[PDB]
Amino acid sequence: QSKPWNRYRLPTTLLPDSYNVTLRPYLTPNADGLYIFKGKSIVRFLCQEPTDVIIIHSKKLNYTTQGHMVVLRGVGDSQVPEIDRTELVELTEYLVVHLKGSLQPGHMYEMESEFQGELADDLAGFYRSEYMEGNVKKVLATTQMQSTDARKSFPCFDEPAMKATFNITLIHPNNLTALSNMPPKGSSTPLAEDPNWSVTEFETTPVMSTYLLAYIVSEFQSVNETAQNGVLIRIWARPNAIAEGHGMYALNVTGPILNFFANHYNTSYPLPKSDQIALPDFNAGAMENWGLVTYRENALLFDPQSSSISNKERVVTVIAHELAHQWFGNLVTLAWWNDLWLNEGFASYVEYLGADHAEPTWNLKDLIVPGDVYRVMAVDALASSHPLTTPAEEVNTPAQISEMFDSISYSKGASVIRMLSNFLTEDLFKEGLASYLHAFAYQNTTYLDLWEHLQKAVDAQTSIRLPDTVRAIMDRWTLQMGFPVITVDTKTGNISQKHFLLDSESNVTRSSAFDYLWIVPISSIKNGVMQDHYWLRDVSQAQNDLFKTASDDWVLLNVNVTGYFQVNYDEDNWRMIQHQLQTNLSVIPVINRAQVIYDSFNLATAHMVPVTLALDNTLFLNGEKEYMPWQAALSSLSYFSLMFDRSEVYGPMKKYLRKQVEPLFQHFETLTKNWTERPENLMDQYSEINAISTACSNGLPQCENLAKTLFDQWMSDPENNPIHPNLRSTIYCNAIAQGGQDQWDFAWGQLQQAQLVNEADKLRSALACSNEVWLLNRYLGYTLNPDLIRKQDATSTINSIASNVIGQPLAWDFVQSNWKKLFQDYGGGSFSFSNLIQGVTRRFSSEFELQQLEQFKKNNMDVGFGSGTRALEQALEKTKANIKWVKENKEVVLNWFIEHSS
C-alpha cells in the first residue's frame, strides 16, 4: 500500500469548514530584486474518519511558524494530538503533518501557519504585475488561483468540491486600495508595527471553492453603478484609463447582464457587489473569481474613438461569459476537473444569451455557429480528438488538469449544450437548470446531476417528447469524441449517419461504446417552410418521407445549425438548393446559407462531394448582403488562397472574387453614403468589414482607390485620423501596399507613438503589407530589436510578413538564418517557436519546399527546436498533405475559377 502524501488526490478524511487568511505583499524588492509576500492562515476543518496525518496543499511557500511548520489546536474542548513532524512533499504539492495520535470523527481542529513566498511576475497565485504610468514603473499585487494555484498563496485543501468560507485580511501600503471577493468590513486601519501600512478586513465569503478566491492591492480607481436591488457594481482600471472613460461600456452592460442571468437562472446574484478589474498583460484573458472578476485590459476596457465593433463584441461577450459563472461554476461547482467542459461549455453558450440581452439589436446568438461550432468541428473531425467526458480517475496532476482547458471543452461544450437546449426548448431547459442550481447551491455536482434535473423537467410535462432519456441521448455526445455526417438521398428520403473525418483515409483507433452512432435531433425546412422535427436513432440508415422530395422541391436540414453535425445531400437537392439561392435567397435562413458553404467544403475535404460542388455553393454570393454566408466562404477559401496565391490559379480566383464582391462593395458605397456613416447593426457592420477587406485584397480598383484616398487624407492630417476603426486594418494594409516609404514611414511613426494596443496591432500588421522587398527586409531587421519591436510581438510580426506572398520567401530565410537565436530566446521570455514555424511553413505545398524543410531540420546538431520541438514534425506532415491536396485539386480548381470569372 502506498503513502497518501504520494497520491495526487487529497484524502476525504478531513474537510475544511473555514479559513482566516491574512496576506501582506511587499511591493518594494529586497535590493537583490526579490519581491515577497508574507502570510498567516488558520484553517478550521472537521474529522470525518480517524487519521494520524493531515495532508493539505502547499506550493512554493516557506514556513516561519514557531515550532513545527504549523500549530494544531482543538476547537472548543476537543483535545488534539501532538505533532510528530511536518514535511513538504514537493511533487504532489503537500504540507504533511504527522501526528503522535489520531484525530477523532466529529471533532473540529484549527491549524495555524505563517509563511512567505515569492511575489513573482508569473501570473500564478499571489503574484506581482508591473506596468507604466508616466515615468513611473508601478507594481501591484493580484491573484490567479485557477486552477491549482490557491496553494501557492496559502496552505489549503485546494480541490474544488472542498468548499469553505473565507475571511481575508490584506495588509498593504496605506495609500493603496485593497480588494477581495467580498466588500471590506469597514475602514482600513493602520498597522501598529508600522502605520505606513494599513489593514483591510473583508466580510466572510459564502461557502466556496479555493480556485475562485481573489485579492488585489493597487492604485486602481473605479466607475460605479448601484443596480436597483442594491448590488454595487464597479469597474476598476488604471487611473489614467478610468479618466479617459474606457470603463464606460463595461459599466453600461454589466448591470443588464447580471439581471438577465438572475432571471434566466431564476436565482438571485448571491453576492452584495460585483467588481470587475482590468489588468495590464493578464495573459490568462479573464477569470471568473466570485465577486472580483479579472480581465486583461483589451478585454474589459473600450475606447469609442479608436476601437472597432468587433472590439465591442469582445467586451460584451467576455463580460457575459465571466458573469455567467457567478451562478454556473461558482454557486454550483463541478466536483472535479474532468467535468470542466460542463462549466466552461455552459458559460461559452450563455455568454451569447447574456450579451444578447445587453445588445438586443445585434443578433449575437448567431455568432456561436462560426465562432464555436465550425471552429471546434475542425478539430473534432480528427482521429486525434477526445470526448467531452474524461474519466475522473485519469485527471490527477496539475498538468492533466490544465489539459482540460481546450477547444473541445469550451466550444463543443457550448455547441452540445446549445443543441440540448434547442431540443428541449429553452423554457424547459431553464426549468431543469433552475432546479439544478437550487438543489446544489453552495455544493458540487457532476454532469449526471444536470441530466437528472433536466429529466425531472421533461418528466413533469407533455409537450416535448424524446426518443430516450436525456442521459442516454447526451451520453452519445459526451462519452465519445467526434460528430456524424448526416447524408440524405432526397430521391428516397433515406438518411444515414457516419463518424465524420476530414481525412477520408484516417484510421480511427479510439473505440466508442456506441460504435460512433449518435441519437441525433434533426430539424428541417422544405421550400422555405419548417417541417416536423425528426429524431435519428442509433442506427446507420433510416427512411422518412420528410426527406423525400419532388423534382421542383428541395429539402435542407439542421435549421440554424442547432444540431452538432454536418449535412450532405444528393447532387440534385444540392443543385436545387443552389437555384433557390440564385433566385430568392431570403427563403433560406441566413445561418443555413452559411451552412451550405461550411459543410460542402468540409465534405469536399473528406471526398464526399467534389470540390466543384463546394465552389458552386459560393456562386450565389454576388447577391448576398449578409455577414455569415460571406464569412463561411472567406473562411473556407483562405486555404485555397494559401495554396494557390503563388500559382496560375490565383489570377482566376481573384477575378472570380472581384466579380462576387463588387455588387456588395457597391451596395455599401450607397448605403454608407460614400463611406461617411457605418451601417446600423453589428452583423451589417461585419459584412461591410469583410467586403471591403475582400474587395481590396482581390484588387477591386474602387476599393484600392478608397484605401489610397483615405490614407492620403490621413497623412495630410496626422492628428485627425479619417479612417473608421472598423476599416483600419484593410485601409491601412492596402494603402501601404499601393505605396512606398512615404506611407510605410508615416505608419511606422504612428506605431511608435500609438498608445492603445489594438491600434498598434493594426499598424504592425498593415506594415507587413508593403510590396517592396527592401521595406520588408528592413522591417524584419527590426523584429529582433526590443527598442523598436516588443519581444512579445516579434514572432507575430514575422508571421505577418510571411503572410505577404512577397514576404513568404523573405521570412523563411530570416528564420532559417536566425535559428541561431533559440539560445538567446529560451531563458528570457518563451518566444513560441511553435507559432513562428507553423506560420512561415504554412504555404509549403511542393516536393521542392519539403526538401528545403528537411534540409533545414538537418541543423539538428543541438540548438534544438525548443518549445517548437516537433512543431517542426507537424510542419513536415502538413506539407505532405498540401502537396497531395494540390496535386488532386489544382486542375479542377483552376478550370472552375476560369470558367466562373466571367
Ligand X SMILES: *[C@@H]1O[C@H](CO)[C@@H](O[C@@H]2O[C@H](CO)[C@@H](O[C@@H]3O[C@H](CO)[C@@H](O)[C@H](O)[C@H]3NC(C)=O)[C@H](O)[C@H]2NC(C)=O)[C@H](O)[C@H]1NC(C)=O
Ligand Y SMILES: *[C@@H]1O[C@H](CO)[C@@H](O[C@@H]2O[C@H](CO)[C@@H](O)[C@H](O)[C@H]2NC(C)=O)[C@H](O)[C@H]1NC(C)=O
Ligand Z SMILES: *[C@@H]1O[C@H](CO)[C@@H](O)[C@H](O)[C@H]1NC(C)=O
> Under rule CB under 6 A, which residues in 135-194 are in contact with ligand BES?
146
Beta strands at 484-489 and 566-569: parallel, antiparallel or unpaired: parallel
290 or 732: CB nearest ligand BES: 290
Beta strands at 443-445 and 555-557: parallel, antiparallel or unpaired: unpaired
Specify the DSSP class assigned to residue 545.
G
The correct pick among 7, 29, 50, 62 for binding ligand X (CB under 6 A) is: 62
287 in a known ligand binding site: yes
* Strand, helix or coil for residue 486: strand
As a whole number of angstroms, the distance between CA 76 and CA 229 comes to 39
The correct pick among 239, 304, 528, 701 for binding ligand X (CB under 6 A) is: 304
Say which of 114, 159, 322, 662 is annotated catalytic: 322
The correct pick among 66, 462, 463, 507 for binding ligand Z (CB under 6 A) is: 507
As a whole number of angstroms, the distance between CA 883 and CA 617 comes to 25
As a whole number of angstroms, the distance between CA 449 and CA 589 comes to 35
> Under rule CB under 6 A, which residues in 276-335 are in contact with ligand BES?
284-288, 318, 321-322, 325
Q: Which does 304 bind (CB under 5 to 8 A by kind): ligand Y, ligand Z, ligand X, none?
A: ligand X
Using CB under 6 A as the binding rule, whether residue 110 contacts ligand X is answered as yes
The correct pick among 584, 622, 785, 855 for binding ligand Z (CB under 6 A) is: 584
> Under rule CB under 6 A, which residues in 13-32 are in contact with ligand X?
20, 32
Estimate to the nearest angstrom the gap between the alpha carbon of 685 and the chain centroid.
Answer: 23
Please name every residue paired with 498 in a beta bridge, in sequence order, or none if there are none: 485
Using CB under 5 A as the binding rule, whether residue 286 contacts Zn ion is answered as no
Using CB under 6 A as the binding rule, whether residue 23 contacts ligand BES is answered as no
* Strand, helix or coil for residue 872: helix
Per CB under 6 A, the segment of 203-211, 583-591, 655-663, 786-794 that binds ligand Z is 583-591
Q: Which does 245 bind (CB under 5 to 8 A by kind): ligand Z, ligand BES, ligand Y, none?
A: none
Using CB under 6 A as the binding rule, whether residue 587 contacts ligand Z is answered as yes
Report in angstroms the alpha-carbon separations of 641 from 80, 354, 453, 654.
73, 37, 49, 9
DSSP H stretches of helix in 556-681: 571-583, 590-605, 611-616, 627-644, 650-671
> Under rule CB under 6 A, which residues in 339-368 are in contact with ligand BES?
344
CB of 18 to ligand Y, least distance (A): 4
Neighbours of 244 (CB within 10 A): 16
**Sign of the torsion angle spanned by Cα atoms 123, 127, 128, 129:** positive
Q: Which does 347 bind (CB under 5 to 8 A by kind): ligand Z, Zn ion, ligand X, none?
A: Zn ion
Q: Which does 586 bind (CB under 5 to 8 A by kind): ligand BES, ligand X, ligand Z, none?
A: ligand Z
36 or 53: CB nearest ligand X: 36
214 or 606: CB nearest ligand BES: 214
324 or 822: CB nearest ligand Y: 324
CB of 172 to ligand Y, least distance (A): 11
Q: Which does 587 bind (CB under 5 to 8 A by kind): ligand BES, Zn ion, ligand Z, none?
A: ligand Z
As a whole number of angstroms, the distance between CA 349 and CA 412 comes to 10
Using CB under 6 A as the binding rule, whether residue 36 contacts ligand X is answered as yes
Using CB under 6 A as the binding rule, whether residue 359 contacts ligand X is answered as no
Do residues 273 and 233 make contact, with C-beta atoms less than 8 angstroms apart?
A: yes
CB closest to ligand BES, residue no: 285
325 in a known ligand binding site: yes
Estimate to the nearest angstrom the gap between the alpha carbon of 751 and the chain centroid.
Answer: 27
Q: Which does 288 bind (CB under 5 to 8 A by kind): ligand BES, ligand Z, ligand Y, none?
A: ligand BES
Using CB under 6 A as the binding rule, whether residue 505 contacts ligand Z is answered as yes
Please name every residue paired with 333 in a beta bridge, in sequence order, or none if there are none: 444
Number of helices and strands in the chain (H, E): 29, 31
* Strand, helix or coil for residue 693: helix
Per CB under 6 A, the segment of 33-41, 91-99, 305-313, 582-590 that binds ligand Z is 582-590
How many Cα atoms occupy the beta-carbon half-sphere of 678 within 13 Å? Answer: 16
As a whole number of angstroms, the distance between CA 190 and CA 177 comes to 13
Do residues 83 and 66 make contact, with C-beta atoms less than 8 angstroms apart?
A: no
289 in a known ligand binding site: yes
CB of 44 to ligand X, least distance (A): 6
Burial class, 879, CB count within 10 angstroms (exposed 0-12 / middle 13-18 / buried 19+): buried
The correct pick among 216, 320, 347, 893 for binding Zn ion (CB under 5 A) is: 347
As a whole number of angstroms, the distance between CA 813 and CA 792 comes to 21
502 or 710: CB nearest ligand Z: 502
Specify the DSSP class assigned to residue 384.
T
* Strand, helix or coil for residue 673: coil
Using CB under 6 A as the binding rule, whether residue 255 contacts ligand X is answered as no
- Angle value at C-alpha 376, between 368 and 618, nearest 5 degrees: 70
285 in a known ligand binding site: yes
Q: Does the annotation count 219 as an active-site position? A: no
Using CB under 6 A as the binding rule, whether residue 851 contacts ligand Z is answered as no
Residues classed as catalytic: 322
Give the residue numbers of the binding site for Zn(2+): 321, 325, 344
Give the residue numbers of the binding site for substrate: 285-289
Applying CB under 5 A, the residues found at the interface with Zn ion are 344, 347
Give the residue numbers of the binding site: 285-289, 321, 325, 344
Applying CB under 6 A, the residues found at the interface with ligand Z are 505, 507, 584, 586-587
Applying CB under 6 A, the residues found at the interface with ligand BES are 146, 284-288, 318, 321-322, 325, 344, 405, 410
